[PDB]
Subunit: 248 residues, 3 copies
């Protein structure tokens, strides 16, 4: 059986939101190292990889590796009612077809218990592309979020140009033609060459909801290669998205 208590459900609420944006069901891999969702979107273009490390939690027990299919829709619909500042313990007793969240008040005056059915989740097609990333750029997560919401009013394909002295997000639509430019303030560009990719803005949008977790996001790029955008969870996990460049 697995047991994993978070001090503040804050985290789970902020986390499941991000990943429910990409996929409506995902397998949690629970080894003793910690919890680990790694799923693809249905178009096989974007991949989430989240790791919560054991020291993320106040209580963690997972003797042997169980895999739990959860419906992230339902999980979302529940965590939406769990209070920010309540604790949330997630258990599964090994034989059962259910997982169980339990939410206590600091002052123990109120206890909530919800239980969700597990699923058989079919395809773990996967393949964490991890190549070598030449170009990097790091910025206030919420700025990144605004910039994709901004580029969205124009077209549906942000074009990111990276150069010694800053980064240029450009889009184009019927409304006209935008560009936001961030001078290398703040904004830690640190590349090897000039480098320009483009990207489905739908997905950048799903990823940018990341800003709920980390003051700062990091985008990593390489030619012909999936960008990765990584949100650091404290020093106790990562939410990490990869997305195929647009070509054709």
């Amino acid at each position: 059986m697995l047991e994993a208590q978070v001090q503040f459900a804050s985290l789970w609420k902020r986390l499941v939101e991000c990943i429910n944006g990409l996929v409506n069901e995902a397998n949690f891999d629970c080894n003793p190292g910690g919890l680990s969702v790694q799923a693809m979107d249905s178009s096989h273009v974007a991949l989430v990889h989240m790791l919560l490390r054991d020291d993320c939690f106040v209580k963690y027990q997972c003797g042997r590796n169980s895999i739990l299919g959860l419906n992230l829709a339902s999980l979302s619909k529940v965590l939406k009612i769990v209070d920010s500042n309540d604790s949330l313990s997630l258990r599964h007793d090994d034989d059962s077809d259910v997982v169980t969240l339990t939410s206590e008040n600091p002052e123990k005056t109120r206890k909530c218990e919800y239980q969700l059915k597990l699923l058989e989740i079919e395809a773990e097609s996967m393949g964490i592309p991890e190549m070598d990333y030449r170009s990097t750029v790091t910025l206030n997560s919420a700025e990144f979020a605004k910039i994709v919401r901004d580029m969205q009013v124009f077209g549906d394909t942000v074009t990111i140009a990276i150069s010694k002295e800053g980064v240029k997000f450009s889009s184009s639509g019927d409304v006209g033609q935008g560009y936001t430019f961030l001078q290398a303030a703040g904004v830690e560009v640190t590349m090897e060459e000039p480098i320009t990719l483009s990207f489905a803005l739908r997905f950048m949008g799903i990823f940018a909801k990341g800003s709920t977790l980390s003051e700062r996001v990091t985008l990593k790029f390489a030619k012909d290669s999936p960008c990765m955008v990584e949100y650091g969870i404290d020093n106790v996990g990562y939410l990490r998205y990869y997305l195929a460049p647009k070509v054709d």
Copy 2:
């Protein structure tokens, strides 16, 4: 001939929003002892009693045991645009066919006068449930209101277990099962029975709007009988809702 000025219009606004959830039109029973609204919902499962005692107001004139039929659709739409912190004078002149709401700011610089046509509404047979209740829980009005929204993500029916330990709202549906357990002292049980009934959340919802009126709420239960939810309005009135149990 009647006039009822209240100092802070907030009271009227919050009240009409409360009973408007349940019914579209209702009779404003005006005695020398106070205003009373008694009204059953169209599906005959659910009752409002609303009393505002004579002291609740500032001016309150009413010899005659005079009645008023009022379109709460209309009344609500008007009270919407009346400043929370303005005076609201409800007047009806020796047999008009219209009520007049009149409104002034403290500084007497703005005056608002609204006129509503009255209805004939048959005073409903309905009558109040007769039971004395031996099982009472009192809890924070807003925690109550949260727990219905909470439970409604699962089902359309909520089971309320009263026990010396405390009340336990359970519900179930497609998403899965939940409950919210409260402990006694937040919460004031007065049981003498392992008594546990079930109820329509559509209605528990409508009721819990009561939170706008009173920081606490009392629920009363008789074995196989209508529950009452009471919202004390200062010590100058009550809003009382009664609802039928779900049974076999």
Copy 3:
């Protein structure tokens, strides 16, 4: 070679907003006088004159006098993404098909630059009553706004009645009848004959959105005259609406 840099873009934002209320597109007359929009709604009942004198900018520049046709909806969408507290340099160049907006922060570490197609629009045919204005009445822009959306719960014709006592805003319909009355010698009435006209609230609504600019608002009237509602952009320009009265 037009250039028109405001310092706080919130003005461009708050303006286009008001006037987009009335028309989807509008010519921007750019004398070295300054920018002026002049335009009519589809139904040719209502008129917008706005003028920003050159003193209004921090870098005006306009040798000759170009007209600029703009899709206001396209411009409004772009201006929604622009930060209140940034630069906003406008700019047409000779024979050029496209105008260009250009935000930049105080801290000069984020250049934004957008590019809209110009339209061709049949220059304004009907062009200002240019009247006396017998009756006047100034009052808080925000209260005026409140009062129109008040009278909208009733009907969609407001009857404005002025005497020296104050100004009554009357309105009737299915719900009933309201009148909001304000008092003089903070309501700056002053007429030369009590008169009382009527108007479409549809349009008073669209106007009132000017409350975002001037804190006060001046209404002017005259028997069977196109009323006007003025809004000083403090003193670096104005925004003027004119509306045909409803007549018998």
